[PDB]
Design a protein around this ligand. Sequence first.
Ligand SMILES: Nc1ncnc2c1ncn2[C@@H]1O[C@H](COP(=O)(O)OP(=O)(O)OP(=O)(O)O)[C@@H](O)[C@H]1O
Lengths: 246, 246, 246, 246, 246, 246, 246, 246
Amino acid sequence: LPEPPRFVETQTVKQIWTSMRFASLTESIAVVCGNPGVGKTEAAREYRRTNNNVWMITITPSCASVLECLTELAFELGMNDAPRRKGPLSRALRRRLEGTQGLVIIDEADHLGAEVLEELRLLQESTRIGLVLMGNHRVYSNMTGGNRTVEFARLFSRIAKRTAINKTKKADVKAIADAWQINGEKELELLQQIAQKPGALRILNHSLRLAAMTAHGKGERVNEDYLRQAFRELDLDVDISTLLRN
Amino acid sequence: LPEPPRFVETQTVKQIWTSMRFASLTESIAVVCGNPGVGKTEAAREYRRTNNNVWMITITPSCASVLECLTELAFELGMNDAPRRKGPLSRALRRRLEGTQGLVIIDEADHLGAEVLEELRLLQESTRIGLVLMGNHRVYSNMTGGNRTVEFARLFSRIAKRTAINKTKKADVKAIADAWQINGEKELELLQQIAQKPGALRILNHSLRLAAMTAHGKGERVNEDYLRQAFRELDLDVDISTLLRN
Amino acid sequence: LPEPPRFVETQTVKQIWTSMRFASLTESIAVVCGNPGVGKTEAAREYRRTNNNVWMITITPSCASVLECLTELAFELGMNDAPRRKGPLSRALRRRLEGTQGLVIIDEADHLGAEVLEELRLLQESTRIGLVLMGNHRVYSNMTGGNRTVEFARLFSRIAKRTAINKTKKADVKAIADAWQINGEKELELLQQIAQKPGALRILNHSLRLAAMTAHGKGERVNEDYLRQAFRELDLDVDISTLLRN
Amino acid sequence: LPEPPRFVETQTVKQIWTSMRFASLTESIAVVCGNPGVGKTEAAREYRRTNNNVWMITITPSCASVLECLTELAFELGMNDAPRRKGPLSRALRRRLEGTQGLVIIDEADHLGAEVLEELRLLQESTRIGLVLMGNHRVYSNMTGGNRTVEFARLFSRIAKRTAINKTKKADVKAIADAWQINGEKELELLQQIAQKPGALRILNHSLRLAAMTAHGKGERVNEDYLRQAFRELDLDVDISTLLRN
Amino acid sequence: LPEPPRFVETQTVKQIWTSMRFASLTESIAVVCGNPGVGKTEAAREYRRTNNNVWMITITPSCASVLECLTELAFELGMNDAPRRKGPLSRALRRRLEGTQGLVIIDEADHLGAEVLEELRLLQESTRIGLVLMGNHRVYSNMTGGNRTVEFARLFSRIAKRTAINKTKKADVKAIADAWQINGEKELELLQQIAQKPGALRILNHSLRLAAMTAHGKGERVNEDYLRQAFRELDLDVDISTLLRN
Amino acid sequence: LPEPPRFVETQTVKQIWTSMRFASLTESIAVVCGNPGVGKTEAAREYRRTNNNVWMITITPSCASVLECLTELAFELGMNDAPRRKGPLSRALRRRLEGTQGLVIIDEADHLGAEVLEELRLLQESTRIGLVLMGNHRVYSNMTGGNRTVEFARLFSRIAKRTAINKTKKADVKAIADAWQINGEKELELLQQIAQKPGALRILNHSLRLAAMTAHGKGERVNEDYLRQAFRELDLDVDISTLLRN
Amino acid sequence: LPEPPRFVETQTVKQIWTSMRFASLTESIAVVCGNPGVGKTEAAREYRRTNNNVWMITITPSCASVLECLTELAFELGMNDAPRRKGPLSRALRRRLEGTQGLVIIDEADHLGAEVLEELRLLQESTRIGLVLMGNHRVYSNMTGGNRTVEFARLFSRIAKRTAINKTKKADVKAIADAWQINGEKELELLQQIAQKPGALRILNHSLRLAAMTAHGKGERVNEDYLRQAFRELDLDVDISTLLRN
Amino acid sequence: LPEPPRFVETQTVKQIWTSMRFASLTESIAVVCGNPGVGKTEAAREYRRTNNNVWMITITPSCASVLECLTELAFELGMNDAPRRKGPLSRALRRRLEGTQGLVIIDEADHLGAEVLEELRLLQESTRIGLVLMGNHRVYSNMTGGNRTVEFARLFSRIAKRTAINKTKKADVKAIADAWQINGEKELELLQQIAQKPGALRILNHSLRLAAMTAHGKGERVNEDYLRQAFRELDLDVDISTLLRN
DNA sequence: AAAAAAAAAAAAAAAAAAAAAAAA
DNA sequence: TTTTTTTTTTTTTTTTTTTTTTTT
Ligand SMILES: Nc1ncnc2c1ncn2[C@@H]1O[C@H](COP(=O)(O)OP(=O)(O)OP(=O)(O)O)[C@@H](O)[C@H]1O
């Protein structure tokens, strides 16, 4: 019956916000790398919404070059009239970002190459801001493993605080259930089981939203039956590569 | 005598449409991969024609790169003046697709590489639309099987609902026959046999259209004789790799 | 004395033309694969000459990639200003070929790989034209034999009608002899014997042209003697790999 | 005393020129494969010099790929600004060689692989010219011997006339002696003996040139003594793999 | 006391140089293969130093492929900007080497395979230069012995003059002693005995240089004692595979 | 109490250094092969440390191919940006090593095959450096024994000085004891007895270090008791293949 | 009732740990070979878990080659992006393992061939770590017995400490019983008798776990009856090769 | 009249299932070997069908090597894109089977060699699954009899539970008859007599199916007459050896 | 012990034609 | 006009190796 909670401050969200606060305070690059669906992107979005002078961009493979990444950062800054060349855009970003003590949150930073990462590191160094590189466990692995540990030496030195989010914690699903008004022990155990699945918090949110929608359509309250039905839906455990083969 | 039916709503078509509706509502990526000639592309085309704010593109090996796939998507959107660079085109697609709650159906998505699939994934994430990847069993097999379950981890994580179409069901051919005005039990059995041949509805439609054309030319009604003649035609059981040796 | 016939409509030519007409009407891929020198390439050329909206290309190993094959198809279309990229060229071909109900005859289609064949079948599907793959037994043997029957599954399902030309039939050589004004039973027997040689119809044409040229030079009518002299020429039965050894 | 004859029209040269004329007239591939030092390369060079619209290239192992062989052919054609890709170069060759009824002489053609030979065959077919292939017995042995006769089936069918040069005939050495002003019966017998050695005509030419140079230096006429001295030179009968052992 | 002679024109050097001049004049391939330490490499180096338009390369097992061998030849030619592909490099070598009547000296030619030797032979044929191949008995043994006499048939036919250097002759050591200011009969006998050892002239030069260095250090003239001490050094007659066992 | 000596100059070390100086001066290949644990590798390492323009590499079975051995040599040279192909890397090594009169110490050279040994031999010949092969008796045994004395003929001829180290000499262990401050006659006899054990100097060093560590832990001086305890340790006389059986 | 102990520090475990510590300190190869089921692999695993900079790999017959064994070691090191060639992987291992003074425990080292054992020995030499070879009596028997004591001479010389585990000792089973809370003298005697059976500690662990499971299911305490039932199970005394015959 | 039962849960099937459960629980290898046709393979297949995370492969002499056996195991796992090398395939199997608590049943394991059995044992050890060897008495006889019991010592120690199936038991045929709706005492005696014949359950099933087919053809019920006729059929007592010679 | 066959397959160039948008 | 870039790619192979097995 109640409207779904758009965002809840879980333990993982609190840790990620602490990492971003440290990055903005010490003015050094921070790495927030975790497995998919652990609450990273929504934590970054909520941090951007609730904190002034915080700018967040995502790195698509189309915006994975220096000019396109700088243009994305400028568009996030509101500089809709930014120059379309590398040098003028870099200088405009240096002028606009300086003196703000901001926090440029590079979501999906694993797509960044060496040149773009060097450009971002130089921008942070000459701007004195926080640069939170996000993504998956490839963010750290890109800066280590042979020739990459000497080319990325300066960038790896800039990294002050690094956070690894392996799996969604029990406190996270507990907070989500509390925000969803769920009290049943069986329901909590089912939510915890859904959490350990790949795409942890995404699958948890999909199951919760589908169960809430089904209960609202049927005019009843959400219980373990609706959660189980939603989790059995989505065909998560379907080996569809073998279904077509056989 | 009556005109052939352009499209008939079948069980497989209904399941695919349910998957599309779920993808558009939940705003998460869905996978619809089936064996050749099971009714995926035609159902997707009918969904696009009957529903507003629904966009369909096909992924040829020529349009299997980020720039070309984004250009195809823009051309589907009606943005005939789309930018020719990766970044500006991605931003234009983000502005155009946002706020529509649409459904971008990526037909033949098995041709997409890691880069293009990742870019489309990020576009869906930052746009809040539904992405329906189609093709064959290789769509799922690309995202699983070793090193590709950690590179495609995030893309696998967004996948909300996946639908398997191994072979066309009896209800599908029953609906096709009813739309074709076929009542004979022998004709129904012949259609059922025709469906299980490789390329189920491709061969079924070819045989039905040929039988109808032959009957109309001869001025008679369609019966089992014309169906059998059409099925014996098309040389499906011709091992044309051995008619030359022997 | 009479001028040689540049082309004669025969049984093999009639069957190949029936296959091409079926491919153009049903708008589905057709395969015309036979042994060398049976009357396939000339049949396709004559079909292109006598039928409008019919475009024929040959696939050299240099034009066996997607970009080069699409450029060859565009040049056949008269699009001498075709784009030099894969995507723009594919879209230009989609625009130009659409609405014509044409017939793209891919001569020597055995050279095409999986990528180019997949691109061509997708172009045919999105354009609603007839695609005729031509060549030798490898045209079909490429789409069967293990992993190639599941990668080429959709393309194999596209194949509506497949025609095998193992050896030149008796009616074919009879029609050619009639076009060459040959009545002698011994001459017909010699022509039939010449046909069964490898490179059947090429050897037939070479022998006929040589005999006609020699008879015209000598001022006499063509008879079995000139045919025998021409056939004993061309050194068909010369084991030239053992003449050097011995 | 008289200057050596650069080229003399021997019987083998006449046969090779007849094969070349037949290939250029019939517009079909011809094979001229013989033992080393029989006069094939010099006959081809003289044919190219004395006949217009005749182009000759040689196939080194570096120029044994499609792009490099096509570039060699273009450079022979005088197209010094030829494109550096397979497709554009093939199309440029098709445009330039078409309408000339020329004769593309492929010297050392046994080095061509299946791909390059197939491309050259298709170029000849779509250009209507004469392709002449030479080398050693491996030219024919490449297109025969099991799987090689079904892969090279079309190319073997193209072959109109094939000429074998096992060893230089008595007429060849007779013509060479006549051009060299040699009348002695012992000298003719010695030249015939020199011919039967491996590398027949190369050894013959080397011996004749050495004898002529020695006679000119000594101010005398060439006789059997100088021929014998030259033939005992060149160390043909030196088992140098055993001279080091013993 | 006097400085050692860098190079002395021995009888073996004279014979090798005669072979080089014959190869450069006749413009045909020559082979100079002999046992280790006989003076072939130094003779080639001195010929390159004292004669213009003479190019010498050595064939390491890394430079035993067509591309690397052609790059070595180009670097010897001074073409420091040679193309890195097979075809363009071959054409550049053809253009640069043509019209010079040079002498491409292939040291250690026994490492060349069939492909590289074939390419070098065709380069010499189409360039009209002299190709000199050195090494050991395996240079000729590679072109004879079964299937190797028919694959290497043309290359064997090209060979104009082949020179065998089994062991250094008495004239060689006599000239070396004369250049070294050695007159004692015992010293001459000791040098002759040193020559017959494996690595004839390598050991001879090493012993002479060591004796001269020791005499210069002691301030005396070189005599039989110093040569004997040097020859007893170098541990030539040490069965070092048995000193460890016993 | 005193720190262990890192390295001590002994008779075997002096002989090996004399061989290395001879190889670097004469610019010819030298062989230093001996039984395991005789002081070869440490002598080579100390020579590299104390002498400029001296480069040492070891040949692991993975680095026993031409490309990998050349890459090892380049990495020893400091060429961290060396090319990854055989030819360019060989030319880079030729350029870098030339004009230095250096000494390439090939430790564990018995793992090199014919190809890699030939490449290193030609590199030394074209560079005028000292190639000091090292290892065990197989270094020489690979170059003799039938067909191996004619394939390795040039390499064997180039071997200037070969040094055999069967067992560590009495002077070697005497110098080691002097560096270890050992005066007891019983201790000297025990060290000599330890020397004759297999892995002579490895075992001697292990025993000395263990005795010194035990004495330092107990606060006493090293005597015969500690050496005997260390030698009874290390379980050299344990027939561990019969302990498990019994 | 109490949970089973995952690991107990037996006397054999203490001896194996002493050997591993000696190998890591002395930086020399150690051998831990014994009869199966004595407590070797679990001791190595526990040592790896409790000590930092300790890497343990196992040698399957598929991982018995140099490349696969080095890849196994790299994967144990944590570099999932290790190069797949012999040389680059060896250099990456040398770089990563250097400066750590680690302990690479090669479990099941009896499967290693001469090449792989030599490569691991050289890696340990150039890295200064402790290589602990494990397995059965064949580990030593591979390095002794004729030709194998001279090829494996260096590897045998580098073996610092070798430890024999013939059978599980009384102290080991006493410690296991103490960790299992077993006090009965009859139970202790039964455990001792179980130990002397082949596969000593595997059988002991299986019997103890089955007895504990049966007691927990029946709600009683483990005594002599449950251990006797478990030992009579597992069908150790079943001559199953004679049951089928009779 | 009733359809034949596909499977019946017999006493032998129950014992085999108990052995498989024990193997999957104790995480140790189990051996299920018996006489041919005693209900082993079908019991294993039924257990695989009715249990999750259970994988069954058969070992034929074609797939009796390490690479092919691992490929078959991977194909059973559904990894149709498994690597083709020994090491990568072994690592992929280790990653896929780890944590699944699986049970790999190796049907007809007597064909496995020492290398493949060792690889499977190490895979089970490092994966913690249940390896069920299967076949005939050779499975155990390969692990005992001299040198085979010291080479297979570890594998023999790994074997937890071994089950012998000498012949089909009375309860087995009783359950089969009950599932086949047979009540006659004479029919039961005939089935029992059929069971003791070689190929016990294969022969019993063949006789029962033939009798049922004959009864259905004649429209009567199965009784002793039909079973006797079926048993006299199949030529079980026909000695082919003596009829042909005589 | 010796010769031949059938793969996987992974790292490394390099090089050349085509727009193609934008600022002064 | 003048320039600045820029980026996107598409093909070019090229090699180096790395077993895997299979038989005689
Ligand atoms: N429970 C059962 N009910 C009916 N038939 C059975 C049953 N178990 C086995 N069979 C029959 O046994 C035959 C083959 O299975 P079975 O286990 O006897 O083979 P096997 O000789 O052990 O096999 P292999 O030696 O190849 O592993 C079939 O005819 C099958 O019908």
